[PDB]
Amino acid sequence: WTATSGSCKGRCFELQEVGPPDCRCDNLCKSYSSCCHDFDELCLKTARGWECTKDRCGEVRNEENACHCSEDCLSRGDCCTNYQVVCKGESHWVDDDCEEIKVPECPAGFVRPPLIIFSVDGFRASYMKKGSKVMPNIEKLRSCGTHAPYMRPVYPTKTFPNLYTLATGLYPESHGIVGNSMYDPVFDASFHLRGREKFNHRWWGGQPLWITATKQGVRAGTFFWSVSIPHERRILTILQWLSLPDNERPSVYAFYSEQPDFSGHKYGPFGPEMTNPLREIDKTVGQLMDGLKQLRLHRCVNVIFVGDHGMEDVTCDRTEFLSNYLTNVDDITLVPGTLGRIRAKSINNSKYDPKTIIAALTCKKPDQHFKPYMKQHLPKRLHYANNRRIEDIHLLVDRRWHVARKPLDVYKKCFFQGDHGFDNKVNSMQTVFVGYGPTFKYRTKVPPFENIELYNVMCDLLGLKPAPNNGTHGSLNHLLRTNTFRPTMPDEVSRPNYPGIMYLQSEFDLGCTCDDKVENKLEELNKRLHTKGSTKERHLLYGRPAVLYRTSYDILYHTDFESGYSEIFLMPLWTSYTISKQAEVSSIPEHLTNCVRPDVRVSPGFSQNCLAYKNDKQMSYGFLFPPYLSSSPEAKYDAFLVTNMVPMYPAFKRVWAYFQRVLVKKYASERNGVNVISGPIFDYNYDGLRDTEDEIKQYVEGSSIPVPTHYYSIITSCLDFTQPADKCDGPLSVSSFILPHRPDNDESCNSSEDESKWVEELMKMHTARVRDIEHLTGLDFYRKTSRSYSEILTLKTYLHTYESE
Numbered sequence: 001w002t003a004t005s006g007s008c009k010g011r012c013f014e015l016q017e018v019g020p021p022d023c024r025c026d027n028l029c030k031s032y033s034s035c036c037h038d039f040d041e042l043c044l045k046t047a048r049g050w051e052c053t054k055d056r057c058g059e060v061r062n063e064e065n066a067c068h069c070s071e072d073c074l075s076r077g078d079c080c081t082n083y084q085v086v087c088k089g090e091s092h093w094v095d096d097d098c099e100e101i102k103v104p105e106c107p108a109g110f111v112r113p114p115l116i117i118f119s120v121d122g123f124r125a126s127y128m129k130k131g132s133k134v135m136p137n138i139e140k141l142r143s144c145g146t147h148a149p150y151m152r153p154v155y156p157t158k159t160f161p162n163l164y165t166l167a168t169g170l171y172p173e174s175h176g177i178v179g180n181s182m183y184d185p186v187f188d189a190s191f192h193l194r195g196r197e198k199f200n201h202r203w204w205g206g207q208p209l210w211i212t213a214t215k216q217g218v219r220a221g222t223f224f225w226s227v228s229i230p231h232e233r234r235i236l237t238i239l240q241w242l243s244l245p246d247n248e249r250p251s252v253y254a255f256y257s258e259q260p261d262f263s264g265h266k267y268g269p270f271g272p273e274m275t276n277p278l279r280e281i282d283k284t285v286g287q288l289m290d291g292l293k294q295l296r297l298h299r300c301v302n303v304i305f306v307g308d309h310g311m312e313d314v315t316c317d318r319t320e321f322l323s324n325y326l327t328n329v330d331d332i333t334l335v336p337g338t339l340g341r342i343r344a345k346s347i348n349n350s351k352y353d354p355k356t357i358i359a360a361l362t363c364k365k366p367d368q369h370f371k372p373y374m375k376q377h378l379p380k381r382l383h384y385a386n387n388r389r390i391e392d393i394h395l396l397v398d399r400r401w402h403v404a405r406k407p408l409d410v411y412k413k414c415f416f417q418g419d420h421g422f423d424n425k426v427n428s429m430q431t432v433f434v435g436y437g438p439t440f441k442y443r444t445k446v447p448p449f450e451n452i453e454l455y456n457v458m459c460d461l462l463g464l465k466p467a468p469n470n471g472t473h474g475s476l477n478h479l480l481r482t483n484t485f486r487p488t489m490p491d492e493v494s495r496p497n498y499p500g501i502m503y504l505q506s507e508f509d510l511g512c513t514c515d516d517k518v519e520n521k522l523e524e525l526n527k528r529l530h531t532k533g534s535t536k537e538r539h540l541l542y543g544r545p546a547v548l549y550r551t552s553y554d555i556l557y558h559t560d561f562e563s564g565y566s567e568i569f570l571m572p573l574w575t576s577y578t579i580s581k582q583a584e585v586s587s588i589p590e591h592l593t594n595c596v597r598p599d600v601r602v603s604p605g606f607s608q609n610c611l612a613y614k615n616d617k618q619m620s621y622g623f624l625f626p627p628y629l630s631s632s633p634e635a636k637y638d639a640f641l642v643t644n645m646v647p648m649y650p651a652f653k654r655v656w657a658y659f660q661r662v663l664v665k666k667y668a669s670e671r672n673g674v675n676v677i678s679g680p681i682f683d684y685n686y687d688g689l690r691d692t693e694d695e696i697k698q699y700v701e702g703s704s705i706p707v708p709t710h711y712y713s714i715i716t717s718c719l720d721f722t723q724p725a726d727k728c729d730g731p732l733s734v735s736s737f738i739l740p741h742r743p744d745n746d747e748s749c750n751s752s753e754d755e756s757k758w759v760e761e762l763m764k765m766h767t768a769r770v771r772d773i774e775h776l777t778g779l780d781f782y783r784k785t786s787r788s789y790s791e792i793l794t795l796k797t798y799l800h801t802y803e804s805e
């Protein structure tokens with residue numbers, strides 16, 4: 001019930017919410033059908049439109065008008081945004097030259113520069129260049145302030161997950177808005193864009209910026225706008241709140257535009273019909289900036305211009321139908337479109353089987369335009385699994401396509417020419433970031449970054465402590481003139497042991513063999529120095545990784561590589577080696593094919609054994625430092641130490657051996673040397689965080705040797721490739737991956753072909769940030785470089801995407 005006979009007189013766009021049944025006058029009352037009877041008349045005035053004209057200048061105030069051009073409008077804070085231009089000979093903000101804002105220039109009574117977030121739906125990154133001729137105000141923000149060539153959204157690249165990620169700094173698996181449509185099996189309730197379930201607070205986790213602000217004493221405008229409120233009235237409302245008295249005035253505001261997304265779905269991302277929505281959005285930015293200029297706030301407020309996701313060409317004919325693959329199509333529920341999520345239609349059917357659905361959807365048609373995954377197998381960079389609202393079975397849809405359950409779903413629903421939701425590394429899905437104001441830098445371009453980082457920066461802009469989130473605070477310090485956050489590196493929790501030679505060969509009973517009994521004081525002191533760390537500066541270039549949890553591990557040195565060997569997991573946590581551009585690849589010699597050698601620094605009890613692999617018919621082994629890249633025949637024996645061995649499915653060994661034999665030397669050639677850190681990851685509860693021992697679900701049969709869910713590598717070189725990786729004076733360059741450790745290559749449809757045709761494609765799909773690996777291992781890399789810590793945090797958030805420009 002709403003008692004809609006209250007009044008909005010003196011309450012239009014009130015900031016505090018009034019509870020049912022009393023009627024509301026806030027910017028969300030329409031969406032709840034709860035506005036007072038006189039909300040339209042009082043709060044949504046339209047008379048005489050949105051612009052002053054010469055003949056209105058100096059008019060007698062008429063309270064009916066949408067906005068005013070009477071002499072008293074400046075002190076009332078309700079002039080039309082163009083009032084000073086039409087009536088007082090002033091210029092539009094866009095016509096003024098840009099001039100560096102070195103210090104905030106704020107009216108007295110302003111405690112801090114306000115922040116205005118101007119959010120645009122479906123604004124594809126490339127619109128900034130391609131539409132620049134019809135967007136002069138946006139182009140002035142971009143060229144005079146701080147801009148990125150693009151900003152990466154979160155997956156799925158849909159509105160609700162992304163706007164709420166912008167507001168919280170959280171991945172959708174953590175904040176709970178994992179799609180525009182969701183079923184929660186614990187609530188037994190469905191969330192949809194249409195209707196009332198979405199307003200229930202139980203769906204929305206984390207802490208959005210307006211709550212962070214309010215908890216810390218910083219007042220916030222209400223961020224949400226009902227769709228029927230015209231944009232001109234939204235801008236006027238913001239400008240009116242900015243005229244409130246000091247103690248009542250908010251410091252943070254949001255504007256939202258449904259465009260250009262609305263027209264992009266109808267016309268495609270570059271339909272000729274898209275020029276006018278871009279012009280209209282630019283005009284709205286111009287009203288805001290003119291309005292700030294009237295209030296003397298145009299060199300006081302920080303403005304962020306930001307989008308939720310881009311837009312791709314998608315039409316009805318590019319739809320795959322599950323009815324062309326599955327026999328049982330009526331036994332499933334599909335969430336369809338630019339991603340798929342599948343679950344059982346009925347929980348009472350125990351002849352539903354995910355294994356059979358996946359197999360029926362795998363590589364079944366030559367050009368197939370989607371790929372099925374159990375969610376724990378999705379690329380870890382998507383961070384899309386740890387939530388009960390994410391169905392176990394997921395379809396990753398190719399850009400430009402849809403999936404649907406049956407043809408009748410698509411013609412009983414062609415209209416549309418645009419859509420979005422695909423993998424967040426797809427170029428068409430990228431969106432925009434510009435920051436302009438006293439706290440942002442002047443005429444500065446910054447590299448692309450992820451939208452999960454912005455909440456921390458918005459908190460820095462407002463002097464707030466951010467709630468715990470998934471940004472890396474400090475990684476965006478290079479966007480800011482001041483208010484930077486100066487983090488300190490985490491403290492190491494476990495210090496390593498440095499074992500020497502402590503065991504005789506006969507103490508080991510591992511079932512391993514090696515033909516190594518090939519028997520010099522010159523060369524002998526030398527090999528002793530290598531085991532004590534004499535080449536360590538060449539192979540460990542950025543210091544040893546720090547171990548941020550409690551565990552027992554050993555540093556082991558070798559001529560060609562250094563490792564941190566876990567006595568608990570029986571294998572290295574990390575293995576670090578440098579490969580110069582001059583390095584040569586060699587074979588594994590015949591007599592060494594099955595060689596595994598006890599390591600006399602590490603007890604039998606803290607070693608793997610060969611018998612376990614012999615007996616486990618599913619599981620084989622590989623090595624972390626590759627024997628192919630040994631510096632000499634004699635050094636190569638170190639690569640067969642049992643402390644360099646790790647468990648690998650034979651199907652995974654295909655991928656790993658090709659990476660190590662072919663790709664590393666390719667990278668060294670191209671990048672002028674590389675330093676590689678490789679290791680295992682265990683994430684059996686798919687939470688993106690390092691597993692403890694009692695979470696491990698699989699061991700090499702009959703043993704305590706844990707099986708990794710993934711293998712990573714971090715591949716670092718000099719950004720100035722004219723300097724070799726091991727003698728780099730300035731910034732670094734990194735690419736990394738987290739490969740899933742699977743017992744088949746069903747993910748790669750062309751895996752019967754030579755590895756040259758499919759392995760690197762797989763690795764690109766599983767590209768990762770160094771920070772993703774940090775979460776999954778509890779290790780902290782790049783501890784000892786020449787570089788500032790914020791620069792290193794930016795390097796750790798980099799993702800190498802393998803998209804063109």
Ligand SMILES: *[C@@H]1O[C@H](CO)[C@@H](O[C@@H]2O[C@H](CO)[C@@H](O[C@@H]3O[C@H](CO[C@H]4O[C@H](CO)[C@@H](O)[C@H](O[C@H]5O[C@H](CO)[C@@H](O)[C@H](O)[C@@H]5O[C@H]5O[C@H](CO)[C@@H](O)[C@H](O)[C@@H]5O)[C@@H]4O)[C@@H](O)[C@H](O[C@H]4O[C@H](CO)[C@@H](O)[C@H](O)[C@@H]4O[C@H]4O[C@H](CO)[C@@H](O)[C@H](O)[C@@H]4O)[C@@H]3O)[C@H](O)[C@H]2NC(C)=O)[C@H](O)[C@H]1NC(C)=O
Pocket residue numbers: 170171173174175176202203204205206383386387388468469470687688689775
């Ligand atoms: C990205 O950043 C985020 C934020 O930093 C990281 O997420 C944090 O990760 C921590 C570990 O996974 C986690 O800390 C746990 O908190 C538990 C208390 O939880 C409530 O309180 C917080 C704070 O206000 C709150 O935000 C939580 O919100 C979640 O849950 C509600 C729904 O109930 C949602 O609305 C909301 O969206 C959010 O859901 C997400 O997180 C949960 C897990 O908390 C998932 O289940 C969801 O799928 C979704 O992703 C809560 O309201 C606390 O209980 C935990 O302690 C347990 O484990 C420790 C080990 O130290 C042990 O001492 C205890 O025994 C205890 O276990 C007991 O319970 C078990 C379960 O019943 C049981 O098995 C045992 O036998 C025991 O009885 C733990 O400290 C923190 O909640 C989240 N925060 C958020 C906001 O998500 C995230 O990791 C980052 N991601 C990456 C990749 O880095």
Ligand SMILES: Cc1nnn(Cc2cc(C(F)(F)F)ccc2CCC(=O)N2CCN(c3ccc(S(N)(=O)=O)cc3F)CC2)n1
Pocket residue numbers: 117119159160161163164165166167168193194223224225226227254255256
């Ligand atoms: C979601 C979400 N999370 N946080 N916020 C708040 C937020 C955060 C941020 C920012 F600062 F974070 F950037 C910036 C702006 C906003 C306000 C967004 C807003 O006013 N709307 C209401 C209209 N919405 C909407 C879209 C489409 C349809 S449909 N399918 O029926 O056409 C129905 C809808 F209700 C989009 C959200 N929105």
Ligand SMILES: [Ca+2]
Pocket residue numbers: 121122158159160261308309
């Ligand atoms: Ca959107």
Ligand SMILES: [Ca+2]
Pocket residue numbers: 682683684685686687688689690691
């Ligand atoms: Ca885990």
Ligand SMILES: [Cl-]
Pocket residue numbers: 156158178179180181335
């Ligand atoms: Cl969805």
Ligand code: NA
Pocket residue numbers: 612613614615616617618619620
């Ligand atoms: Na085996």
Ligand code: NA
Pocket residue numbers: 745746747748749750751752
């Ligand atoms: Na295959």
Ligand SMILES: [Zn+2]
Pocket residue numbers: 122261262265420
């Ligand atoms: Zn859309």
